[PDB]
Write a protein that binds this ligand. Sequence first.
Ligand SMILES: [Mg+2]
Ligand SMILES: [Mg+2]
Ligand SMILES: [Mg+2]
Ligand SMILES: [Mg+2]
Length: 234
Amino acid sequence: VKELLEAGVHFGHERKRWNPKFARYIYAERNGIHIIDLQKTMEELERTFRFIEDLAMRGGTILFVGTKKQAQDIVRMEAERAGMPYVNQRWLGGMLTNFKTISQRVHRLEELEALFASPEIEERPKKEQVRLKHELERLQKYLSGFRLLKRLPDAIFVVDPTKEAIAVREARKLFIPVIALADTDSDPDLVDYIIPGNDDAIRSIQLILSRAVDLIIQARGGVVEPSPSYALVQ
RNA sequence: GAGCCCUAGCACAGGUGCUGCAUGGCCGUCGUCAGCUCGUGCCGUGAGGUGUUGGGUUAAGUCCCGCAACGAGCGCAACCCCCG
Ligand SMILES: [Mg+2]
Ligand SMILES: [Mg+2]
Ligand SMILES: [Mg+2]
Ligand SMILES: [Mg+2]
């Protein structure tokens, strides 16, 4: 189910904060706003999903990023709802590019997995039960979706690339294909497979980002429900 | 002419004689001041920068939140002694 499902509540977004490189994917300045030509949305979807498919059934790992305010959660849903890695709270200087080092944080996160369930089940110089169980605190918060990922992904999926630029940069540096949902905010030129959409409305992120995860599990057989995601959707 | 010890020579001893501006070691000092760095990534043609900066907080670069950085090292703290 696609087509008018998109016009559902998810077409055009921002106005007069545009990138004129995005002028190709626009329908009009109707009532002050940029409303985004959907025929070409759909157009780009086929090519993009086509890439996802092939990538997925060839057994690839996509890396999902959405640190954005109201995308935050509907990421770690569909990301985990497909066993793919995700970056949720904040992108870090050189997850990809400084990958080896940023990994020793995960290498050392699960050292503390294995100190919870431990012979030190309740022991070690008692003020070290915040000193270390608050190290695992931060480690937890950030590397929760990143922890799976043990070689660079074969792709990345991004919700707002002008928001998420520090990532996309690393991607392109590393020849890693950039998949993203992008609106009039953004610079198409450096998004390899674009979902000309709406970086913002939670429904729009949902419709799109879930289907893409359908396609992913569905390209290893075993489709499920209407997705464990409708947040407080409101 | 084994050792030892004497006098005559010999190779050497000795020197608190100079150079702390040839030096080691040890000390003083800014100063127990909250600092000085490195590894990798990143930015810059480059010297270099980021990190360490910022907002809150500490006796402290002490910790917190934030952030193209993420972590480490010598410091600080703690591990030692005395007094309750
Ligand atoms: Mg001297
Ligand atoms: Mg000297
Ligand atoms: Mg003198
Ligand atoms: Mg002198």
